[PDB]
């Protein structure tokens, strides 16, 4: 009668990051974007689709730049959360009870 | 046949009937610089 159970209660810190990027619009670009809000028989379709094509291309580049950078951030914190093998392995090996 | 040869994979063959009248031609490419999205608002 010397056996009793024990429970462990560790808690984790949530931490906090973000991601930011820049995205530029020209004066001619935004001025044409204003007329496409009221797209009608006026505002020519070929130039309108050229504008939305170029701006959607640039918007998708800046959108998946975040998607690219997420891997960099996670690999960086993985390097920040690692001890060497040549340090840990003799510690894990040559220690019977402590 | 040039196509069934293994060297054919290094070329993209395409037809062009009006080539004998070509004086001159250009083609363009618009590959952009890929960027990373680092966290800080810089």
């Amino acid at each position: 009668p010397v056996d009793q159970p024990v429970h462990n209660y560790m808690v984790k810190r949530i931490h906090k990051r973000s991601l930011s990027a820049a995205f530029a619009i020209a004066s001619e670009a935004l001025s044409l974007l204003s007329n496409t809000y009221v797209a009608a028989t006026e505002i020519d379709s070929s130039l309108r689709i050229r504008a939305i094509q170029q701006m959607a291309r640039n918007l998708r580049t800046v959108s998946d730049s975040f998607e690219r950078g997420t891997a960099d951030q996670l690999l960086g914190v993985l390097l920040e959360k690692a001890p060497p093998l040549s340090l840990l392995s003799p510690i894990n090996k040559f220690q019977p009870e402590g | 046949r040039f196509l069934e040869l293994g060297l054919s994979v290094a070329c993209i063959c395409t037809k062009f009937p009006e080539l004998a009248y070509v004086r001159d031609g250009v083609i363009q490419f618009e590959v952009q610089q890929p960027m990373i999205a680092r966290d800080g608002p810089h």
Binding site: L33, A51, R57 | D24, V26, Q28, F29
Partner: peptide, 21 residues
């Protein structure tokens, strides 16, 4: 502006040849 198109999905740009006459 409205998009009015698919959100890209691996844009394959067009090769244009310009012949001079």
């Amino acid at each position: 502006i409205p998009a009015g198109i698919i959100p890209t999905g691996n844009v394959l740009s067009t090769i244009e040849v310009c012949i001079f006459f």
